[PDB]
Amino acid sequence: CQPIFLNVLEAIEPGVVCAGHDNNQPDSFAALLSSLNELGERQLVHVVKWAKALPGFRNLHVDDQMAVIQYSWMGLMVFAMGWRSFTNVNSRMLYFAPDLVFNEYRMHKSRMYSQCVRMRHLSQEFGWLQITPQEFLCMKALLLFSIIPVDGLKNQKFFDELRMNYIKELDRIIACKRKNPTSCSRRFYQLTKLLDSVQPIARELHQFTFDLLIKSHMVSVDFPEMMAEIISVQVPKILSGKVKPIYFHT
């Protein structure tokens, strides 16, 4: 038998994305953030194309399709970035883009050093936990179905069904090569725990970007069109508690 699911995830996995950052200029907060915002914009495009091509994704109500994307983009991009950092530079730095790699010095200048160390720890997790390329792909797909609005979705039933299936596929990935149900359970524990630790980080980044937007005109930080729109219309909903993450643990 062949893995139809994993073949799809592997096939739709977006390629390298550049930030268009001028590494010839001395570092500065304005330039670093303004570049991260541009990077975010670019990656968003790929995140849309990626998601639209996910198994059973089109079964979701068109409105819910756009919603889960606007709520989880952060966690998805942070998770994907933590993985590039582990596979490209063995977590020595934050590999946001080939043309935008952060060392402690840059983490500091970005004024979000603590958050960055958080992401470095996340990057190292892929190592200590020995996260296979396949487990990663499935984990990322799942993060798109990890943050729902308290008032519920247009069609909350479909989402629950879809999300369920992806968890079912993650059970298969873990079940593969593992014959004992205890090690299967023990592994699910670790992955779900790892997937949860992504939310606190996303939250901090959500809050940080939110404030940055409000005082952007004062600190000379440029926000791309969509970025500003999402952060001012969707992000606030998460920060105000109207939209919440789905943790596996408490």
Binding site: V48, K52, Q65, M66, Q70, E225, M226, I230, Q234
Partner: peptide, 11 residues
Amino acid sequence: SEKFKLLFQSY
């Protein structure tokens, strides 16, 4: 949301 919508629409 109005810009993300157009992006979403045209893939």
